[PDB]
Amino acid sequence: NYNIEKVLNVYLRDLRIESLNNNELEILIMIRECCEVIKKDYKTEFNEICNFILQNNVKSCYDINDVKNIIIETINSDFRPSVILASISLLSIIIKKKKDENNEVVDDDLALNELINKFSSYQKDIISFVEKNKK
């Protein structure tokens, strides 16, 4: 009936929104709205995370390979629907900060792809979390 992985690929990998069916589009709207609040409420804390990884990257760039291992480890040790959305929101911030501030190029398709595969196992919980916060 629906596939979360494309919805995350639309939200994170700038995949054309037209690849989504009605459900996957509704799911996208809920994820977009939920993550924007997380990005706004915790803008300060994410930046501290993002600003930390920046100084520890050899090329002074935001690279998802750096944060890749951290997120997957965080999820297994902590499997709450909230910890997943914080990862998506952090990752979404890195993507634009990558786009807006990197003076060099970075290859992280594989890194990000592995991350989205992890989020899709927990899709059942994500839909539950984003749906509740729709109210």
């Binding site: 930390f52 291992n69 480890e73 040790s77 709450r80 910890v83 509740k132």
Partner: peptide
């Protein structure tokens, strides 16, 4: 694992703050 645990905790705390807010 040193650097990893500090950043995971910052992330885990963001989840705790989220559950408290929305419950």
């Amino acid at each position: 694992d040193a650097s990893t645990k500090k950043l995971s905790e910052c992330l885990k705390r963001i989840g705790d703050e989220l559950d408290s807010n929305m419950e």
